[PDB]
Design an enzyme around this catalytic site. Structure first.
Site, PDB file in Angstrom:
ATOM      1  CB  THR A 296     -32.619  28.047  14.232  1.00 15.97           C
ATOM      2  OG1 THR A 296     -32.289  28.831  15.385  1.00 15.97           O
ATOM      3  CG2 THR A 296     -31.687  26.839  14.185  1.00 15.97           C
ATOM      4  N   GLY A 297     -31.916  27.491  11.091  1.00 11.06           N
ATOM      5  CA  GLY A 297     -32.153  26.620   9.950  1.00 11.06           C
ATOM      6  C   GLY A 297     -31.584  25.251  10.261  1.00 11.06           C
TER       7      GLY A 297
ATOM      8  CG  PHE B  22     -27.147  24.187   6.594  1.00  5.34           C
ATOM      9  CD1 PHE B  22     -28.418  23.915   6.083  1.00  5.34           C
ATOM     10  CD2 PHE B  22     -26.325  25.068   5.900  1.00  5.34           C
ATOM     11  CE1 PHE B  22     -28.862  24.520   4.916  1.00  5.34           C
ATOM     12  CE2 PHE B  22     -26.765  25.674   4.729  1.00  5.34           C
ATOM     13  CZ  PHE B  22     -28.033  25.400   4.237  1.00  5.34           C
TER      14      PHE B  22
ATOM     15  CE  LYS C 286     -24.903  29.661  15.908  1.00  9.48           C
ATOM     16  NZ  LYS C 286     -24.530  29.667  17.349  1.00  9.48           N
TER      17      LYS C 286
ATOM     18  CG  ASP D 181     -36.206  27.545  -0.889  1.00  8.02           C
ATOM     19  OD1 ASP D 181     -37.307  26.948  -0.811  1.00  8.02           O
ATOM     20  OD2 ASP D 181     -35.403  27.606   0.072  1.00  8.02           O
TER      21      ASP D 181
HETATM   22  C1  LIG Z   1     -37.964  36.760  11.961  1.00  2.10           C
HETATM   23  N1  LIG Z   1     -37.796  38.207  12.251  1.00  2.10           N
HETATM   24  C2  LIG Z   1     -38.585  38.865  13.109  1.00  2.10           C
HETATM   25  C3  LIG Z   1     -38.093  40.134  13.073  1.00  2.10           C
HETATM   26 BR1  LIG Z   1     -38.873  41.581  14.170  1.00  2.10          BR
HETATM   27  C4  LIG Z   1     -37.029  40.330  12.237  1.00  2.10           C
HETATM   28  C5  LIG Z   1     -36.865  39.048  11.725  1.00  2.10           C
HETATM   29  C6  LIG Z   1     -35.817  38.670  10.738  1.00  2.10           C
HETATM   30  O1  LIG Z   1     -35.682  37.494  10.457  1.00  2.10           O
HETATM   31  N2  LIG Z   1     -35.040  39.628  10.237  1.00  2.10           N
HETATM   32  C7  LIG Z   1     -34.048  39.404   9.312  1.00  2.10           C
HETATM   33  N3  LIG Z   1     -33.401  40.457   8.741  1.00  2.10           N
HETATM   34  N4  LIG Z   1     -32.488  39.935   7.793  1.00  2.10           N
HETATM   35  C8  LIG Z   1     -32.605  38.601   7.889  1.00  2.10           C
HETATM   36  C9  LIG Z   1     -33.635  38.199   8.763  1.00  2.10           C
HETATM   37  C10 LIG Z   1     -33.748  36.696   8.747  1.00  2.10           C
HETATM   38  N5  LIG Z   1     -32.760  36.304   7.691  1.00  2.10           N
HETATM   39  C11 LIG Z   1     -32.630  35.052   7.233  1.00  2.10           C
HETATM   40  O2  LIG Z   1     -31.776  34.705   6.425  1.00  2.10           O
HETATM   41  N6  LIG Z   1     -33.525  34.173   7.684  1.00  2.10           N
HETATM   42  C12 LIG Z   1     -33.650  32.830   7.141  1.00  2.10           C
HETATM   43  C13 LIG Z   1     -35.091  32.393   7.415  1.00  2.10           C
HETATM   44  N7  LIG Z   1     -35.470  31.065   6.917  1.00  2.10           N
HETATM   45  C14 LIG Z   1     -36.563  30.953   5.964  1.00  2.10           C
HETATM   46  C15 LIG Z   1     -36.914  29.471   6.027  1.00  2.10           C
HETATM   47  C16 LIG Z   1     -36.051  28.832   7.118  1.00  2.10           C
HETATM   48  C17 LIG Z   1     -34.920  29.807   7.428  1.00  2.10           C
HETATM   49  C18 LIG Z   1     -32.675  31.928   7.803  1.00  2.10           C
HETATM   50  C19 LIG Z   1     -31.776  31.199   7.020  1.00  2.10           C
HETATM   51  C20 LIG Z   1     -30.867  30.329   7.622  1.00  2.10           C
HETATM   52  C21 LIG Z   1     -30.871  30.176   9.011  1.00  2.10           C
HETATM   53  C22 LIG Z   1     -31.778  30.896   9.790  1.00  2.10           C
HETATM   54  C23 LIG Z   1     -32.681  31.774   9.196  1.00  2.10           C
HETATM   55  C24 LIG Z   1     -32.109  37.481   7.077  1.00  2.10           C
HETATM   56  C25 LIG Z   1     -30.577  37.364   7.163  1.00  2.10           C
HETATM   57  C26 LIG Z   1     -31.189  37.841   5.857  1.00  2.10           C
END
Ligand SMILES: Cn1cc(Br)cc1C(=O)Nc1[nH]nc2c1CN(C(=O)N[C@H](CN1CCCC1)c1ccccc1)C21CC1
EC number: 2.7.11.1
Length: 311
Positions: free
Chosen positions: A17-18, A20, A22, A128
């Site tokens: 979650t961020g 604005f 998810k 960032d």
């Molecule tokens: C946390 N986690 C644990 C496992 Br197992 C896999 C993951 C995981 O996040 N996998 C994953 N694959 N691809 C993505 C992610 C997370 N993710 C993200 O984009 N994650 C970011 C993470 N942030 C960094 C600082 C605050 C928000 C995000 C951005 C906006 C809203 C929610 C999340 C991407 C989509 C490109």
């Protein structure tokens, strides 16, 4: 709404979650590949942030950059389908290890430098950089994410907070390097203005376990004056960076889009029972629609040493 997305994806759990947005784990129906879908609401939106990231990712293709597959915009929502990285965030990895050895730090840090150098080579600054924006992919390699701010306070360069992009990214990588080897931030405070002061002064603790070469590199990246700061160029072949490798960081893309992959084109034309030339033509439009998504996910199968097959 979700009707358009559910045509092509099975949705699983929310993985992030961020403020604005998810991010949900999903599976691309046609290929069976896992993906991560960033979901925004066009009502409670900022929106320039979404458009910024989308435009950047359409132009960045690199072994250390999280791949964009599919953009869907409905009446109410914007959906960005991205690479799923099953190793999670770099930040959570550091915490579990306390801190990384110099040797493991260098393995990880060279990937960060590769990604950021490439980003700069394409004419962007990330702005960032932080370990929450670096994820571990299926091959336990790092993938840089979140280009919403491309052209957090703890990672921001003095001149950037001062409002006075390339050098700012180098500073942030200096903070990242410190966190990797130390397990905590060089500048931190509960009071945001007190943090600002600490960043401006540029003084930080040097823990007992850092080597003299590590200390020197941190000094060169964490110069408060961006004119005295080490340049990306000289980071690529820095003696600390070179140790054990003996070659400069390989930043050029190893997976660029040159010609359409024949095997992927054929599988799509066969599966869809469509004229091959029509298929090749429609893929080449690069609309980042479901056709592009299916094409790119097939290419990922191939990169994995797996056969290009649908359904
Ligand atoms: C946390 N986690 C644990 C496992 Br197992 C896999 C993951 C995981 O996040 N996998 C994953 N694959 N691809 C993505 C992610 C997370 N993710 C993200 O984009 N994650 C970011 C993470 N942030 C960094 C600082 C605050 C928000 C995000 C951005 C906006 C809203 C929610 C999340 C991407 C989509 C490109």
């Amino acid at each position: 709404d979700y009707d358009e997305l559910l045509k092509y994806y099975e949705l699983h759990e929310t993985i992030g979650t961020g403020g604005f947005a998810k991010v949900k784990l999903a599976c691309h129906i046609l290929t069976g590949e896992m993906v991560a879908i960033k979901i925004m609401d066009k009502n409670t939106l900022d929106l320039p942030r979404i458009k910024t990231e989308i435009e950047a990712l359409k132009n960045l293709r690199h072994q250390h950059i999280c791949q964009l597959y599919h953009v869907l915009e409905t009446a109410n929502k914007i959906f960005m389908v991205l690479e799923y990285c099953p190793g999670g965030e770099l930040f959570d990895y550091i915490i579990s290890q306390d801190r990384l050895s110099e040797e493991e730090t260098r393995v990880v840090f060279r990937q960060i430098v590769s990604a950021v150098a490439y980003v700069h080579s394409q004419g962007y600054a990330h702005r960032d950089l932080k370990p929450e924006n670096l994820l571990f992919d299926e091959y336990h390699k790092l993938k840089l994410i979140d280009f919403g701010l491309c052209a957090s306070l703890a990672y921001a360069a003095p001149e950037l907070i001062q409002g006075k992009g390339s050098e700012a990214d180098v500073w942030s990588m200096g903070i990242l390097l410190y966190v990797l080897m130390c397990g905590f931030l060089p500048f931190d405070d509960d009071n945001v203005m007190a943090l600002y002061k600490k960043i401006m002064r540029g003084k930080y603790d040097v823990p007992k376990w850092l080597s003299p070469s590590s200390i020197l590199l941190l000094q060169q990246m964490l110069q408060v004056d961006p004119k005295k700061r080490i340049s990306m160029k000289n980071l690529l072949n820095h003696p600390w960076i070179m140790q054990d490798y003996n070659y400069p960081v390989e930043w050029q893309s190893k997976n660029p889009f040159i010609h359409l992959d024949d095997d992927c084109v054929t599988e799509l034309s066969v599966h869809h029972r469509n004229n091959r030339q029509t298929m090749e033509d429609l893929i080449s439009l690069w609309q980042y629609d479901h056709l592009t998504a299916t094409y790119l996910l097939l290419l990922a199968k191939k990169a994995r040493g797996k056969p290009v097959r649908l359904r």
